Structures are given as structure tokens and as C-alpha cells.
Ligand binder design. Structure first.
Ligand SMILES: O=C(O)c1ccc2c(C3CCCCC3)c(-c3ccccc3)n(CC(=O)N3CCOCC3)c2c1
Ligand SMILES: [Mn+2]
Ligand SMILES: [Mn+2]
Length: 512
């Protein structure tokens, strides 16, 4: 069946968009191009590898006990900036236990328990995301009303935050900080006698997800020891929301129908991860890959296994890809065998090596700096809710480009505007933090360790990537950033107290 059906009505914006300040932001203007790509018929033929893997997953899920969240708990865990309801209240009302919101949520719940069939309305919007140089169309976000979103948490918050790690164990990517992710990848790589590995990523994953896939996920969730009401709400949410439903634009017009994964529901990430893990594990068996270890984050997969030889590996990956295609998930680009861990990119990131103060080799997570640099450029001119600049400083603190360029420029701009002490909103790990730039050394030490302030002797490949990136984007080269940083450092040190702590830790690398 078709992943989508369209009426002709447009995906409209709900606010003023901006598609320029080179660096561009996606808008609703491109929605049609995206719609075209994500619209197709899914063919899926399952086999005994898929069935065997599924049985093993259910047996693990069957050891999980999950509870219902109360309305009040689900309200308190609602993110503060999520879209207001159509029924007269918003996130702030939900979070402060307003009677208007609570009573509507109780009524949505009762309807979920009493009606297990009627498709539930969703809004479809174009995502506004900043990229660098052709242009990629906007991604589509599909989400139901706030009152339903609270009810999803009631039924499934305890399940989605518990079950995946039990079912997928060490392969569940979302349990790891970056250093832990690196540690898993490196320890896995080093455990093989002749390691080979590859990243896989599905072309339009959400659209490849079938009704059967979504019901298989529900059947996994129902293997949990759940309360009777949970079982009913989960079934109802599955039939009425997860398998599909109608789409409405921001102007209240009917855009069409969805028969695939919604990107804006509580189960998107856990569901996608479970479903990719299931198809990928089955595909590894068809491919007959030896001593396979998987790492899964949504539909970004890394597989590390024992090499069978060059031509053998190349053919085994073609068989892997063939099986994934049969299960409904063809790749955006065909996977390639890699014999160097550093060359495997997944979740837009890769492992690299530097050295600590003692001269010990330290592995850390990095990425191509093009998109982070472009996003930071944008947030120099405009201003956003997410502050991707600051998030990247935190998540990629050990990297050469975050330390030399991102930290330098942003502490320079903060010195210049006297806004050192002003908290900024920052979206990291699904949650919205209010971060004080002077809190950064503690945040980085906690997340990465003290060595993040002392790494040096980076790999030549990574230094050159950063250098080619600066050159391509017209930004000063690294020698300029070292000079500027000595100036930023001297400045912070003059200010004493906590600013002197930022100069000491964040810019220890710039000293002679
Ligand atoms: O000359 C500088 O001192 C400087 C400083 C910073 C930047 C940046 C960003 C780097 C990361 C931190 C935020 C600022 C850019 C830049 C980077 C990516 C995409 C667009 C601009 N650029 C490039 C840039 O703004 N342009 C426009 C003017 O001339 C060449 C390209 C920077 C230049
Ligand atoms: Mn994909
Ligand atoms: Mn992906």
C-alpha cells in the first residue's frame, strides 16, 4: 500500500519562515519535493530469519514489567515548547496541571479505551532546518494533538524508556553518551581478529515502515507485563494513530492520508530502532556475516563483523542489502565494507583518535564540521530555540573544530556583548536545557571527562577534514583561531571567578 495519499492541498506554514540569511533553511516551499520522494508502495516479504529474530525479541520483552503513568506524571514530562492543543490549552497548562488540560486529557484517555478503531487526526508541517550547500527539501513532521500526546506517555512512556535496552541490549544506540558509543564501537572493533564494518541507512525509513511493522512493534510491547488499561490504550493507539490516519495542514485543510510511520509520536524513535534492529539482525543472518555486532539509532545502523576476505565481504553486503530490501528497507546509498573504523560514519559521526596529557591514545566521537559550522553561522545572525551551536560545543567538545572554532567564536561574541552570564535555551538529547555559558567546563567534564580539555595530536585525516572545511566555507584557517583564542583566553582570565575557569579549561589548548 502507498505510504501516503495526497489531496492536493498544500503543506502550509504556521509561521514566518526564512530560507536564507551558501547556508539555507528548509521551508514549506519545498514540501512537494519531499512528498514525492516519501510517496511509494511498500513490498515486504518476511522469511524465517525475520521470524526467528522476532521470537527472541519477544522472549526478552516478556521479562519487562511496565506501568501506566498517571495523567499528572505524563503532564509533568510534557516538553515545555511543544505545540499547543486545538482544544484551548498549551504545554504550559499541561505542565502546571490546569483543569482545562487535565479534564481534556482524561477524556482523550477514556475515548482511547472506548474506541479502538477511529483514526486520530494529525497535523503535517514542514520542518525548518538549516543546512549547507543541490538543496535538500524540508522533512515532514506528523503529530497528533497535545492531549493525545500526553495519553501516549501515560500508556507507553514507561515502555519506551525501559523496553528497548532490554530487547536490544548493547546494540541500543540511545543509551550511550558519545564517549560510551565510541567505547562500544572500539571495543567491538578490537574484539575481531580481522574486523570489517559498515554503516547502513534506509532511504526514507519512516515511509518504509509498514502496517505489519507497526503491529509487530505493538506485539513486542504487548509481551510486557502491562496493566489491562495499558494493553487497551496501546492497542487503540496502534490502530488509531500508529498504523496511519488523516493529515491536516496548519490551516485546517485535509492534506491526505498516512499509512506509514508518523515522525511526531512518542514511539517513533523506539519503534524505528526496534524495527531496524529486527530487519538488520535478520539480514545479517541471510548474509551469513560472522560474529556480527550491531549498533542501532533509529535507522542508522553500524555492523561490525569478522571479514571473510575482500570479495567475500563485498558480496555479503550485497546479500545483506538484498534482504533488507525484501524486508522493505532499501538503502539511500549501498553500504561499503570498511577495514578502518575511522571511515565508518553513522548518525553523521565517526570515531577518531587523539592523545591525552600523558600521551595515551584516546578515542572520541567527531563528525564532518560543515553542518555544525553552517548552523552556528545562522545563529550568529538570527537566533533560535535550539542553539545548535552550544549543543555541538557540548556533544563534540573533544573535537578539534568545536574547541578551536566553535568555542572560540562564541566566547568571543559573548565577551563582546557582555552576555557571559545570560542563559540560553539549548536542545540536547530530546530535552530543552537553560544553559549558562559559564557552566560549560562542568558540563563538559561530566559528559566527556577532564581529558576533553587536554587532547592533542589529532589524526592527520581529521585535521585535514577540518582544514578543508574552513577553506570551503570561507572561514579563517586554524592559525587565526589559535590567535583569537589566546585573546579570548586572556580576556576571560582577566574577569576572574568563573569566567577565569572557562579561560583555563576551555582554552588551555591555545596557551604556548
Ligand atoms: O572572518 C571571520 O572571522 C569569520 C568567523 C566566523 C565565521 C563563520 C562561522 C564559523 C563557526 C562559528 C560561527 C561563525 C562563517 C561561516 C561558517 C559556515 C557557514 C557560513 C559562515 N564564516 C564565513 C563567512 O561568514 N563568510 C561571509 C563573509 O566572507 C566569507 C564567508 C566566518 C568568518
Ligand atoms: Mn534514512
Ligand atoms: Mn538515518
Amino acid at each position: 500500500s502507498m505510504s501516503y495519499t495526497w489531496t492536493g492541498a498544500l503543506i502550509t506554514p504556521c509561521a514566518a519562515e526564512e530560507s536564507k540569511l551558501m547556508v539555507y533553511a528548509t521551508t514549506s516551499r519545498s514540501a512537494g519535493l519531499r512528498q514525492k520522494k516519501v510517496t511509494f508502495d511498500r513490498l515486504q516479504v518476511l522469511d524465517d530469519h525475520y521470524r526467528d529474530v522476532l521470537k527472541e525479541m519477544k522472549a526478552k520483552a516478556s521479562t519487562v514489567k511496565a506501568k501506566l503513568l498517571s495523567v499528572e506524571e505524563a503532564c509533568k514530562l510534557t516538553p515545555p515548547h511543544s505545540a499547543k492543543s486545538k482544544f484551548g490549552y498549551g504545554a504550559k497548562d499541561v505542565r502546571n496541571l490546569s483543569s482545562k488540560a487535565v479534564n481534556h486529557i482524561h477524556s482523550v484517555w477514556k475515548d482511547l479505551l472506548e474506541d479502538t478503531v477511529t483514526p486520530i487526526d494529525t497535523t503535517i508541517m514542514a520542518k525548518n532546518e538549516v543546512f549547507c550547500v543541490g538543496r535538500k527539501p524540508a522533512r515532514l513532521i506528523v503529530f497528533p494533538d497535545l492531549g493525545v500526546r500526553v495519553c501516549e506517555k501515560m500508556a507507553l512512556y514507561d515502555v519506551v524508556s525501559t523496553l528497548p535496552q532490554v530487547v536490544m541490549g548493547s546494540s541500543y544506540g540511545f543509551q550511550y553518551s558519545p564517549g560510551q558509543r565510541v567505547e562500544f564501537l572500539v571495543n567491538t572493533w578490537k574484539s575481531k581478529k580481522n574486523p570489517m564494518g559498515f554503516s547502513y541507512d534506509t532511504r526514507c525509513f519512516d515511509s518504509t515502515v509498514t502496517e505489519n511493522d507497526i503491529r509487530v512493534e505493538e506485539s513486542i510491547y504487548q509481551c510486557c507485563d502491562l496493566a489491562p488499561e495499558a494493553r487497551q490504550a496501546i492497542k487503540s493507539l496502534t490502530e488509531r494513530l500508529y498504523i496511519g490516519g488523516p493529515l491536516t495542514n496548519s490551516k485546517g485543510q485535509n492534506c491526505g492520508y498516512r499509512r506509514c510511520r508518523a515522525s511526531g509520536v512518542l514511539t517513533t524513535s523506539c519503534g524505528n530502532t526496534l524495527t531496524c534492529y529486527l530487519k538488520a539482525s535478520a539480514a545479517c543472518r541471510a548474509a551469513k556475516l560472522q560474529d556480527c555486532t550491531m549498533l542501532v539509532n533509529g535507522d542508522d545502523l553500524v555492523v561490525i563483523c569478522e571479514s571473510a576476505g575482500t570479495q567475500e565481504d563485498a558480496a555479503s553486503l550485497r546479500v545483506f542489502t538484498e534482504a533488507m530490501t525484501r524486508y522493505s528497507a532499501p538503502p539511500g546509498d549501498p553500504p561499503q565494507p570498511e577495514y578502518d573504523l575511522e571511515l565508518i560514519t553513522s548518525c553523521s559521526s565517526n570515531v577518531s583518535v587523539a592523545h591525552d596529557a600523558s600521551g595515551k591514545r584516546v578515542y572520541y566521537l567527531t563528525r564532518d564540521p560543515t553542518t555544525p559550522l553552517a548552523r552556528a553561522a545562522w545563529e550568529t545572525a538570527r537566533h533560535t530555540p535550539v542553539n545548535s551551536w552550544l549543543g555541538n560545543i557540548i556533544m563534540y567538545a573533544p573535537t578539534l573544530w568545536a574547541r578551536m572554532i566553535l568555542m572560540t567564536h562564541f566566547f568571543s561574541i559573548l565577551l563582546a556583548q557582555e552576555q557571559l552570564e545570560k542563559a540560553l535555551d539549548c536542545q540536547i538529547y530530546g530535552a530543552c536545557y537553560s544553559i549558562e555559558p559559564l557552566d560549560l567546563p562542568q558540563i563538559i567534564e561530566r559528559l566527556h571527562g577532564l581529558s576533553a580539555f587536554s587532547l592533542h595530536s589529532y589524526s592527520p585525516g581529521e585535521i585535514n577534514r577540518v582544514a578543508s572545511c574552513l577553506r570551503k566555507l570561507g572561514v579563517p584557517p586554524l592559525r587565526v583561531w589559535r590567535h583569537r583564542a589566546r585573546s579570548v583566553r586572556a580576556r576571560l582570565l582577566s574577569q576572574g571567578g568563573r569566567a577565569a575557569t572557562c579561560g583555563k579549561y576551555l582554552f588551555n589548548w591555545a596557551v604556548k
